[PDB]
Design a protein around this ligand. Structure first.
Ligand code: MG
Ligand code: MG
Length: 514
């Protein structure tokens, strides 16, 4: 419902250059802040936390890492909940397996959190955020979420602004599980901007940087929108909607940095394309047509097009063409040889789409284990994760080989999307006759109520998050650069099922008022 609002974006080079020039000054100035010698732990942690929440930490990957490494190594006891929880969270998010023992001093000989901390809002907030980065080994943090949650909920109504808005927001969306750009936009405009103790250099820096990057995101969105119009699916395939803007939001959620410009464009096209296919199997193709389509996809030829009805011929050709473009784009860098990994994942998605169709027609309700073996791939997550690597100039063959083994971190990301999707779309899918819905299989397989089935599904998502958190800890199998996209895919789930309009507006329409 966007229209020609994004067909084309004429970037006024003057404003961009001004922004860039000043950003360079602010960047160097901020760098010097990070390298300040005589700073206290609390101050150093808050500085890093602020730069990250402001969405400008990508400029200081090395600096922040070296500083955090020093903090990890010195193991200093801060003694106060606020700093301890923050220290724990930042180290964990950066792969440092800091021991949860740092929380023992805030617990009774029973391991329960000293209820006396219940009046320490700042400590509770940082503990709340830290509880979301826990692993299966962090037994000490078992009751951290419930503890901080109940007390923050109680204190919230009487807190000053913007602290109150920060707490209220956190309770609805924790930092660790939120989409980066979405959380950055919120922190900048709704919190830091209204913070009495704000650092003006950092705020100015954050605003300019966000706005400048937004211009690039707009060029990409415009470029891809033109690409979509050329395909002219609107008239040739009147059963699919112009979801391009939504598809772009997803790509933006996976990575927003300027270096991933090519990657985002490639990713958007894939998301758009597979969306067409999903529509085909869901409400247009007949039993026979779908079987013919699944086969054509597995063969991946073109001569197979003759066995497909006209509408499917358009889709099929476009898909094959898209991958040819990908191969061409990567030719200059000699990376075209990796595209096959994405194709293999697409074939997988289509096979499982077909199987899902078959299950629906037969009225089959498989046990959970069997349901998942097919339903996990239908989320398209393995496929999208593989696709995100295509445009990443550093993604080597080894990285793709690791990804093909279905790494636990990827598996967890996929599971999160699956169980959450099933919990949300259950009602709609049931009234549609889809008795092969995750929640349905769960109920029958275990012999439990819908409520209990959904509760089990939520537990699976929780378990998966802990797995993701563990998968981020050093030593990582591949560079962190390749783990973030998977983590971001899981974050997108949290945002899509708490719909995209407000985020699209805040991220791609409205700039932050400087
Ligand atoms: Mg479908
Ligand atoms: Mg579903």
């Amino acid at each position: 419902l966007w229209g020609d609002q994004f067909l084309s974006f004429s970037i006024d080079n003057q404003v961009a250059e001004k922004y860039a020039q000043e950003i360079e000054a602010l960047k160097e100035q901020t760098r010097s802040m990070l390298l300040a010698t005589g700073r206290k732990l609390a101050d150093t942690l808050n500085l890093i936390d602020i730069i990250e929440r402001l969405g400008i930490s990508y400029h200081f990957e090395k600096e922040i890492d070296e500083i955090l490494d020093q903090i990890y190594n010195q193991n200093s006891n801060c003694n106060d909940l606020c700093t301890s929880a923050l220290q724990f969270r930042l180290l964990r998010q950066h792969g440092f397996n800091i021991s949860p023992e740092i929380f023992s001093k805030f617990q009774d000989e029973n391991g329960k959190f000293k209820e006396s901390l219940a009046s320490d809002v700042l400590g509770l907030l940082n503990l709340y955020e830290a509880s979301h980065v826990r692993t299966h080994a962090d037994d000490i943090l078992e009751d951290a979420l419930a503890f901080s949650t109940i007390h923050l909920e109680s204190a919230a109504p009487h807190l000053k602004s913007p602290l109150r808005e920060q707490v209220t927001h956190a309770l609805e969306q924790c930092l660790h599980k939120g989409v980066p750009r979405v959380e950055t936009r919120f922190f900048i405009s709704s919190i830091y901007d209204k913070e009495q103790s704000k650092n003006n250099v950092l705020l100015r820096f954050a605003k300019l940087d966000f706005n400048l990057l937004q211009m690039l995101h707009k060029q990409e969105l415009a470029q891809v929108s033109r690409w979509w119009k050329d395909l002219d699916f609107v008239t040739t395939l009147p059963y699919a909607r112009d979801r391009v803007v939504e598809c772009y939001f997803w790509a933006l959620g996976v990575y927003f940095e300027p270096q991933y410009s090519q990657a985002r464009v490639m990713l958007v096209k894939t998301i758009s394309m597979i969306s067409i296919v999903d529509d085909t199997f869901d409400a247009y193709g007949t039993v026979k047509e779908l079987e013919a389509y699944t086969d054509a996809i597995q063969r991946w030829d073109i001569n197979e097009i003759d066995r497909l009805p006209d509408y499917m011929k358009i889709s099929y050709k476009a898909i094959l063409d898209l991958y040819k473009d990908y191969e061409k784009e990567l030719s200059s860098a000699g990376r075209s040889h990796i595209v096959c990994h994405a194709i293999e994942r697409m074939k997988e998605v289509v096979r499982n789409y077909n199987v899902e169709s078959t299950w629906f027609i037969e009225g089959y309700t498989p046990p959970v284990s069997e349901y998942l073996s097919n339903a996990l791939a239908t989320t398209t997550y393995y496929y999208l994760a593989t696709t995100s690597y295509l445009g990443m100039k550093s993604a080597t063959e080894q990285d793709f080989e690791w990804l093909s083994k279905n790494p636990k971190i990827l598996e967890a990301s996929v599971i999160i999307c699956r169980v959450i999707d099933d919990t949300a779309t259950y009602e709609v899918e049931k009234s549609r006759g889809q008795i092969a819905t995750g929640i349905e299989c769960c109920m029958r397989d275990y012999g439990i109520s819908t409520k209990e089935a959904m509760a089990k599904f939520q537990n699976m998502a929780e378990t998966a998050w802990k797995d993701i958190n563990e998968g981020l800890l050093r030593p990582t199998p591949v560079s962190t650069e390749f783990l973030t996209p998977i983590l971001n895919l899981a974050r997108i789930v949290e945002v899509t099922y708490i719909v995209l309009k407000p985020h699209i507006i805040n991220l791609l329409v409205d700039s932050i008022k400087i």
